[PDB]
C-alpha cells in the first residue's frame, strides 16, 4: 500500500497548484507547531 504518486485530472491538478501557490493557510496551527519545544533525552 502507501500511495506515492498522485495523478490528478487537469482541473483538479490546477486547483492543487493554486492552493499550493496561495499564501499559507492555517497560520494559527502553524505558529502552534513552531512553538513546540521537545525535551528529548
Amino acid at each position: 500500500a502507501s500511495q506515492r504518486l498522485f495523478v490528478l485530472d487537469n482541473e483538479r491538478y490546477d486547483s492543487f497548484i493554486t492552493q499550493l501557490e496561495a499564501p499559507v493557510q492555517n497560520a494559527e496551527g502553524r505558529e502552534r507547531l513552531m512553538a513546540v519545544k521537545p525535551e528529548w533525552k
Binding site: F6, N10, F16, L20, Q25, R30, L33, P38, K41
Partner: protein, 156 residues
C-alpha cells in the same frame, strides 16, 4: 508518571518493536512488518523514539518522497509524504505526539534546503487524526478527501 524518551533516531534492527501499541492495528503492524524492509530498500526513513535507556519504541514516524502529476506525461510537483505517525497507547498525553510532528516538520524543512520540496502531505485515517494535524498547521488538500498538506516555504 514522568516518562522520558530519547530523541528521534532511525529505526535499526536492535530496536524492540513487539511491545508497541497505538490502538490502530495497521500502524502497529506496519512498524513490525514493513518499516525495516522499507528502511533497507531506501524506500522510506522511519524515525522512532524510545523509553529513556531502552530500545523500547513508544513512538515513530515515517518519511518518503512523493509526486503529484496531471493526466498527461515542475512536471510532477515534489512533496514529502509523512505516511505514519503514532504514539504508544501507554504514553499518550505527554506531548510526544506534537514533539514527533515538530521533529518531522523540522526535518523536512532543512531537507527542503537540499532538494526542492513543495509540501508535506499526510493521510488522516480518522477524524481525531485530522483534528491533530489541523491543530498544527495542516490544510485540506484537493488530491484526496483524507489528504492534508503543510506548505514548505522558501529557504528561511
Amino acid at each position: 508518571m514522568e516518562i522520558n524518551v530519547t530523541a528521534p533516531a532511525l529505526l535499526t534492527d536492535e530496536h524492540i518493536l513487539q511491545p508497541f501499541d497505538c490502538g490502530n492495528e495497521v500502524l502497529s503492524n506496519w512498524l513490525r512488518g514493513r518499516a525495516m524492509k522499507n528502511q533497507m530498500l531506501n524506500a522510506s526513513r522511519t524515525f522512532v523514539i524510545c523509553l529513556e535507556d531502552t530500545l523500547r519504541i513508544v513512538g515513530y514516524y515515517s518519511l518518503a518522497t512523493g509526486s503529484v502529476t496531471h493526466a498527461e506525461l515542475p512536471n510532477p510537483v515534489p512533496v514529502v509524504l509523512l505516511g505514519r505517525l503514532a504514539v504508544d497507547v501507554c504514553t499518550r498525553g505527554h506531548g510526544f505526539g506534537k514533539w514527533l510532528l515538530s521533529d518531522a516538520i523540522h526535518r523536512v524543512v532543512n531537507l527542503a534546503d537540499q532538494v526542492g520540496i513543495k509540501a508535506v502531505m499526510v493521510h488522516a485515517i480518522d477524524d481525531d487524526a485530522r483534528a491533530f494535524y489541523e491543530r498544527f498547521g495542516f490544510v485540506q488538500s484537493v488530491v484526496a478527501p483524507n489528504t492534508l498538506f503543510y506548505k514548505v516555504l522558501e529557504h528561511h
